[PDB]
Design a protein around this motif. Sequence first.
Motif, PDB file in Angstrom:
ATOM      1  N   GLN A   5       9.897   3.138  13.157  1.00  0.00           N
ATOM      2  CA  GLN A   5       8.966   2.430  13.139  1.00  0.00           C
ATOM      3  C   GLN A   5       7.806   2.822  11.784  1.00  0.00           C
ATOM      4  O   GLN A   5       7.146   2.174  11.387  1.00  0.00           O
ATOM      5  CB  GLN A   5       8.098   2.509  14.329  1.00  0.00           C
ATOM      6  N   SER A   6       7.891   4.213  11.529  1.00  0.00           N
ATOM      7  CA  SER A   6       7.166   4.447  10.267  1.00  0.00           C
ATOM      8  C   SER A   6       7.820   4.461   9.011  1.00  0.00           C
ATOM      9  O   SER A   6       7.057   4.937   8.056  1.00  0.00           O
ATOM     10  CB  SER A   6       6.200   5.875  11.005  1.00  0.00           C
ATOM     11  N   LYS A  36       4.919  16.199   5.219  1.00  0.00           N
ATOM     12  CA  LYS A  36       4.433  15.187   6.226  1.00  0.00           C
ATOM     13  C   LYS A  36       5.446  13.772   6.186  1.00  0.00           C
ATOM     14  O   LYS A  36       5.317  13.067   7.180  1.00  0.00           O
ATOM     15  CB  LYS A  36       3.097  14.545   6.110  1.00  0.00           C
ATOM     16  N   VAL A  37       6.169  13.690   5.264  1.00  0.00           N
ATOM     17  CA  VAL A  37       7.138  12.546   4.896  1.00  0.00           C
ATOM     18  C   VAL A  37       8.584  12.865   4.502  1.00  0.00           C
ATOM     19  O   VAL A  37       9.173  12.396   3.666  1.00  0.00           O
ATOM     20  CB  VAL A  37       6.675  11.297   3.892  1.00  0.00           C
ATOM     21  N   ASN A  48       5.870   4.472   1.442  1.00  0.00           N
ATOM     22  CA  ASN A  48       4.443   3.973   0.776  1.00  0.00           C
ATOM     23  C   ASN A  48       3.865   5.231   0.272  1.00  0.00           C
ATOM     24  O   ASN A  48       3.311   5.413  -0.905  1.00  0.00           O
ATOM     25  CB  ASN A  48       3.707   3.156   1.560  1.00  0.00           C
ATOM     26  N   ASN A  49       3.633   6.094   1.184  1.00  0.00           N
ATOM     27  CA  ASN A  49       2.975   7.339   1.066  1.00  0.00           C
ATOM     28  C   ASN A  49       3.668   8.402  -0.057  1.00  0.00           C
ATOM     29  O   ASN A  49       2.834   9.073  -0.763  1.00  0.00           O
ATOM     30  CB  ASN A  49       2.658   8.012   2.409  1.00  0.00           C
ATOM     31  N   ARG A  61      13.989   2.405   1.994  1.00  0.00           N
ATOM     32  CA  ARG A  61      13.923   1.601   3.439  1.00  0.00           C
ATOM     33  C   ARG A  61      15.253   1.339   3.992  1.00  0.00           C
ATOM     34  O   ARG A  61      15.301   1.599   5.119  1.00  0.00           O
ATOM     35  CB  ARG A  61      13.251   0.276   3.045  1.00  0.00           C
ATOM     36  N   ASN A  96       7.993   2.138   6.597  1.00  0.00           N
ATOM     37  CA  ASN A  96       7.447   1.386   5.798  1.00  0.00           C
ATOM     38  C   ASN A  96       6.275   2.216   5.045  1.00  0.00           C
ATOM     39  O   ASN A  96       6.187   2.545   4.031  1.00  0.00           O
ATOM     40  CB  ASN A  96       7.001   0.308   6.219  1.00  0.00           C
ATOM     41  N   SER A  97       5.272   2.729   6.111  1.00  0.00           N
ATOM     42  CA  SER A  97       4.041   3.730   5.821  1.00  0.00           C
ATOM     43  C   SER A  97       4.579   5.219   5.099  1.00  0.00           C
ATOM     44  O   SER A  97       4.138   5.264   4.242  1.00  0.00           O
ATOM     45  CB  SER A  97       3.607   3.952   7.248  1.00  0.00           C
ATOM     46  N   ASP A  98       5.648   5.770   5.644  1.00  0.00           N
ATOM     47  CA  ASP A  98       5.979   6.909   5.017  1.00  0.00           C
ATOM     48  C   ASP A  98       6.632   6.768   3.556  1.00  0.00           C
ATOM     49  O   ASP A  98       6.411   7.632   2.734  1.00  0.00           O
ATOM     50  CB  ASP A  98       7.166   7.488   5.868  1.00  0.00           C
TER      51      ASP A  98
END
Length: 384
Positions: A106-107, A9-10, A113-114, A139, A109-111
């Motif tokens: 756009q994802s 998923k990432v 983190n996960n 990043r 930061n979220s990816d």
Amino acid sequence: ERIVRTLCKVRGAALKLGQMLSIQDDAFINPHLAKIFERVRQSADFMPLKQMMKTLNNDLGPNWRDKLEYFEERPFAAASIGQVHLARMKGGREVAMKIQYPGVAQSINSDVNNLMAVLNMSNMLPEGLFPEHLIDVLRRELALECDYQREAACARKFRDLLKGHPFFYVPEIVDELCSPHVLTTELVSGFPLDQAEGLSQEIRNEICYNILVLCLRELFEFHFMQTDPNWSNFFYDPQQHKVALLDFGATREYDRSFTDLYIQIIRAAADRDRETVRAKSIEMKFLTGYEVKVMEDAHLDAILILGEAFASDEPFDFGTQSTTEKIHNLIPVMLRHRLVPPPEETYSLHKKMGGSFLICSKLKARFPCKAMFEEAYSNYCKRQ
Ligand SMILES: Nc1ncnc2c1ncn2[C@@H]1O[C@H](COP(=O)(O)OP(=O)(O)NP(=O)(O)O)[C@@H](O)[C@H]1O
């Protein structure tokens, strides 16, 4: 245990972390983990057309299908943040369209983190904390990877530098099918060097001899280099006896001051002078000068194995003198976690040389390295 399904998923942040660290089967990091990471790379986790078309209509307009005779709906290869589709343009010209998943930038930061979350929960941090400086670098590298305009310009630029070259070439970029989120190149023949251990000792020697020459040129003559060299991005064609170069997301241009010091490191190592190697490594700011001896000595040993190749007129057996085991200490991974970590340019230069050495080890090549290095060192010295 299938941690793999969550890293898939990432996949982009996972793979980019894997390159930065050497989850590369290396003789230290948990072989449970490197396993998991390999399983992630070879996981075609694919996405409905709809999503790909979203990127295509957004970036190319609604006209875009009109430039093509054919668009193959199943991708033929996964890329780190998207997929690659074969197409044929109106006249018959075959292309590869690399298309991002929508909203990748756009994802980031979220990816990330996960990913840190998945790794933390399976406790393989293993400083024990979230490593601040590494999150920051992962990043930045991901934003860079997302930029296909930048990628298109690096490809065009590499293509100039190899204009007319008798062995290497760079597929042309198709501008009308290039945009921020899509990168389109001419299709290349041949197969990736992954599938090439089955070739003969003479051909393998010759491919790798050329790869290492090119590497010295990228470090010491060109303004530009492919970082993280990977045998899967070199396509060899038997018929023409040429190697195509893919993936210019990897391209960097660094201040000459680093490379000027890196030439001195390798000179000193070719000359078996450990004290010069160490002092220039400190001046480059890879080493602080106050590392624990034992780790310092492990890193100096690894550099001098590369020096042995460049010192010798005998052929160097990369397959047994230059394995990941022999040379992984080029990059002691306990260095990114210090008050002031090594400038990333330093990491690159060691990964570039080390990595080229590994491709030669992987393919079991055997050839002399002295004359290539003395030639490169001499032309660098003429240039001032
Ligand atoms: N012009 C081309 N001709 C044939 N195959 C291609 C072409 N461009 C891309 N591919 C295939 O698609 C794969 C991924 O493209 P690439 O440009 O390497 O994406 P990426 O996300 O950077 N993955 P990596 O190269 O593994 O870092 C390649 O390694 C090839 O197998």
